[PDB]
Amino acid sequence: ATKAVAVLKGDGPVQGIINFEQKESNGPVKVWGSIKGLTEGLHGFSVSEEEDNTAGCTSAGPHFNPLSRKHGGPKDEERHVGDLGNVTADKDGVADVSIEDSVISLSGDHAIIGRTLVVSEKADDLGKGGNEESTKTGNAGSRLACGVIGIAQ
Ligand code: NA
Ligand code: NA
Ligand SMILES: [Zn+2]
Ligand SMILES: [Zn+2]
Ligand SMILES: [Zn+2]
Ligand SMILES: [Zn+2]
């Protein structure tokens, strides 16, 4: 199996450690971990295309979209590879991530390793909003924390 870790950091209090695992090179990817420092409620969770400046949040933003699709929720047929929906933070600001995804991969031509994991200020509207921007980013507001998806050491 192949594994990765992203350490999420930003300018504010949001931080977390997110794990990835994929048993077969074309198998589902499991994603898990906790993010703290969030406001209670839904927060957009995505893989950005950025693979150069993956440290800050400044250069991230455009979702990883190697197949030139429109933005959607993770279970939509039409979605970016980087569209991982929302995570939910509880009352004391902790969101637990538990995702199984069929579109991301840690191997091959479009591997998410090296790309930037991002947690955002607001809910991802899953591409169901009333403007073109919904179909690009889901209108999830500012990026609160991000980090490179690195191969596990
Ligand atoms: Na960072
Ligand atoms: Na964009
Ligand atoms: Zn490049
Ligand atoms: Zn770049
Ligand atoms: Zn390609
Ligand atoms: Zn997207």
Swiss-Prot record:
Cellular compartment(s): Cytoplasm; Nucleus
Binding-site list for Cu cation: 63, 120
Principal location listed in the UniProt entry = cytoplasm
Q: Does the keyword section mention Metal-binding?
A: yes
Q: What is the effect of changing residue 57 to S?
A: Enhances formation of fibrillar aggregates in the absence of bound zinc
What's a BP term from Gene Ontology annotated to this protein? regulation of T cell differentiation in thymus
Query: In this entry, which stretches build a coiled coil?
Result: none
Q: What is the effect of changing residue 4 to V?
A: In ALS1; severe form; reduces structural stability and enzyme activity; increases tendency to form fibrillar aggregates
Q: Which reaction does it catalyse?
A: 2 superoxide + 2 H(+) = H2O2 + O2
Chain residues carrying a lipid of type S-palmitoyl cysteine: 6
What does the annotation give as the result of altering residue 57 to A?
Answer: Exhibits very slow copper acquisition
Report the record's disulfide bonds.
57-146
EC number(s) reported in the record: 1.15.1.1
Numbered residues of crosslink 1-(tryptophan-3-yl)-tryptophan (Trp-Trp) (interchain with W-33): 32
The record's section on InterPro entries has: SOD-like_Cu/Zn_dom_sf, SOD_Cu/Zn_/chaperone, SOD_Cu/Zn_BS, SOD_Cu_Zn_dom
Q: What does this protein do?
A: Destroys radicals which are normally produced within the cells and which are toxic to biological systems.
Report further notes. Answer: The protein (both wild-type and ALS1 variants) has a tendency to form fibrillar aggregates in the absence of the intramolecular disulfide bond or of bound zinc ions. These aggregates may have cytotoxic effects. Zinc binding promotes dimerization and stabilizes the native form.
Show the PANTHER family listed in the entry.
SUPEROXIDE DISMUTASE CU-ZN -RELATED (PTHR10003)
- Listed name of the protein: Superoxide dismutase [Cu-Zn]
Which species is this record about? Homo sapiens
Whichever gene encodes this chain, its name is SOD1
